[PDB]
Amino acid sequence: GSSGSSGVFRYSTSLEKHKLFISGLPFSCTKEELEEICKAHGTVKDLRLVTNRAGKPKGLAYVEYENESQASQAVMKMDGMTIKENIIKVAISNSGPSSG
């Protein structure tokens, strides 16, 4: 939807921005790896890897930073980066609670 700068109201639950979303990652990739690489940009509040019912990496991975500027930088770099011979894409975890 649009974004009205002038004045702010409550329409949809608080949205998250700091969080980051990374898709297209090689199963080989491991948390630690992404962790060390994440802390390279800023403070890593928390890191989680979307696994399957069997515990297999679905390729998706979520990240949590302390500030906003930090995450942004990591997104500008990680966005379209090669990892273990695999081009991974990044995206600011904005979409979450499906309103309707």
Curated annotation (Swiss-Prot):
<comment type="function">
    <text>Regulates Tat transactivation activity through direct interaction. May be a cellular factor for HIV-1 gene expression and viral replication.</text>
</comment>
<feature type="modified residue" description="Phosphoserine">
    <location>
        <position position="69"/>
    </location>
</feature>
<comment type="subunit">
    <text>Component of the 7SK snRNP complex at least composed of P-TEFb (composed of CDK9 and CCNT1/cyclin-T1), HEXIM1, HEXIM2, BCDIN3, SART3 proteins and 7SK and U6 snRNAs. Interacts with AGO1 and AGO2. Interacts with PRPF3 and USP4; the interaction with PRPF3 is direct and recruits USP4 to its substrate PRPF3. Interacts with USP15; the interaction is direct. Interacts with HIV-1 Tat.</text>
</comment>
<comment type="function">
    <text>U6 snRNP-binding protein that functions as a recycling factor of the splicing machinery. Promotes the initial reassembly of U4 and U6 snRNPs following their ejection from the spliceosome during its maturation. Also binds U6atac snRNPs and may function as a recycling factor for U4atac/U6atac spliceosomal snRNP, an initial step in the assembly of U12-type spliceosomal complex. The U12-type spliceosomal complex plays a role in the splicing of introns with non-canonical splice sites. May also function as a substrate-targeting factor for deubiquitinases like USP4 and USP15.</text>
</comment>
<protein>
    <recommendedName>
        <fullName>Spliceosome associated factor 3, U4/U6 recycling protein</fullName>
    </recommendedName>
</protein>
<feature type="domain" description="RRM 2">
    <location>
        <begin position="18"/>
        <end position="94"/>
    </location>
</feature>
<feature type="modified residue" description="Phosphoserine">
    <location>
        <position position="12"/>
    </location>
</feature>
